[PDB]
């Protein structure tokens, strides 16, 4: 009865998180689309066959232009800073410097920028799962902590296969849960991504625990 009051605080501190981070996949997709050209050119000409330094330089220009991509990364930290202080702050600051010191015509330099971007992007996705993790961890319903552990674990495997697809699925699935919307276990990518099915299974188990808690407060 004074347990209900606490289960509600949990459910609430989760709904807040989900609402504040609601647009996370949508903003990372935005970043991805604006950069996929540059990272493509850099990987194309870091392969030892031929090189277009103009291209490999326009690639670098798109990353640094108006310190915007970096800024769009800072926006995503701001959302998760509450839950997981200075996960990303180190790697964003590191990535901004690498772009400043980015030397013209050095291809090994570019390719380091591309690899760093590609890491910083994954890190941003992982920080959503880490923020979920620290919140579900503090839940007094133990069945939910068990489900939440398993969900975090299967979530991270999905990220290592593909970070943007894992994230859009994780955001859609938890957004469904806290909005009392049925979770579909059937794949949304024709089973191309191998980690989806088991993550969706963890998501169903967590629905069950969540749905069990809510009935305590009726």
């Amino acid at each position: 009865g004074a347990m209900g009051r606490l289960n509600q605080r949990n459910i609430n501190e989760l709904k807040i998180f989900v609402e504040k981070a609601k647009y996370y996949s949508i903003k990372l997709d935005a970043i991805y689309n604006e950069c996929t050209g540059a990272y493509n050119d850099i990987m194309t000409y870091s392969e030892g066959t031929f090189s277009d330094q103009s291209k490999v330089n326009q690639a670098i220009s798109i990353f640094k232009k108006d310190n915007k991509i970096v800024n769009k990364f800072k926006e995503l930290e701001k959302i998760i800073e509450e839950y997981k202080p200075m996960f990303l702050s180190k790697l964003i600051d590191d990535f901004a410097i690498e772009l400043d010191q980015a030397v013209d015509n050095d291809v090994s330099n570019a390719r380091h920028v591309a690899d760093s971007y590609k890491k910083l992007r994954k890190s941003v996705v992982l920080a959503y799962i880490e923020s979920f993790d620290v919140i579900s961890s503090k839940f007094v319903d133990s069945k939910f902590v068990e489900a939440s552990k398993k969900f975090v674990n299967k979530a991270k495997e999905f990220v290592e296969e593909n970070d943007l697809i894992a994230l859009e699925c994780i955001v859609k699935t938890i957004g469904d849960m806290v909005n009392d919307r049925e979770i579909n276990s059937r794949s949304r990518y024709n089973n191309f991504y191998k980690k989806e099915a088991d993550f969706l299974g963890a998501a169903v188990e967590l629905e069950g625990a969540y749905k069990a808690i809510k009935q305590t407060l009726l």
Binding site: D29, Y32, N33, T36, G37, Y39, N40, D41, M43, T44, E47, T49, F50, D52, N162, L164, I165, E168, Y189, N190, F192, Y193
Partner: protein, 113 residues
């Protein structure tokens, strides 16, 4: 009958009359109708005989989240290629065909989200 020629995207090695010819080169990212770095420009009946003297070459890029069998392959102005992306990603404006053109690929090949 054939006044000074300008090799768009190239130049001459160094008014004119029919029968005369000049040797010409193509800039780094272009080649000749024969596939070579150089060739003759010929004063003819219908102007200079290589109408379009230098033709662009396109290398198909690695595509993050794409089917990449074709990455590295070289194409020449006028040549097209079937692009396809992993589920979740796609070529923009629901297109499926990219074409090598004077200024390069059109549209640009990328798998977006």
């Amino acid at each position: 009958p054939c006044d000074y020629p300008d090799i768009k995207h190239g130049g001459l090695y160094h008014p004119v009359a029919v029968g005369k010819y000049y040797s010409y080169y193509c800039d780094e990212h272009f080649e000749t109708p024969s596939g070579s770095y150089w060739d003759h420009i010929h004063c003819t009946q219908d102007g200079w005989s290589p109408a379009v003297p230098c033709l662009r070459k396109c290398y198909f890029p690695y595509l993050e989240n794409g089917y990449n069998q074709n990455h590295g392959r070289k194409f020449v102005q006028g040549k097209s290629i079937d692009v396809a992306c992993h589920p979740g990603y796609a070529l923009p404006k629901a297109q499926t065909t990219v074409t090598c053109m004077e200024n390069g690929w059109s549209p640009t090949p990328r798998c977006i989200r």
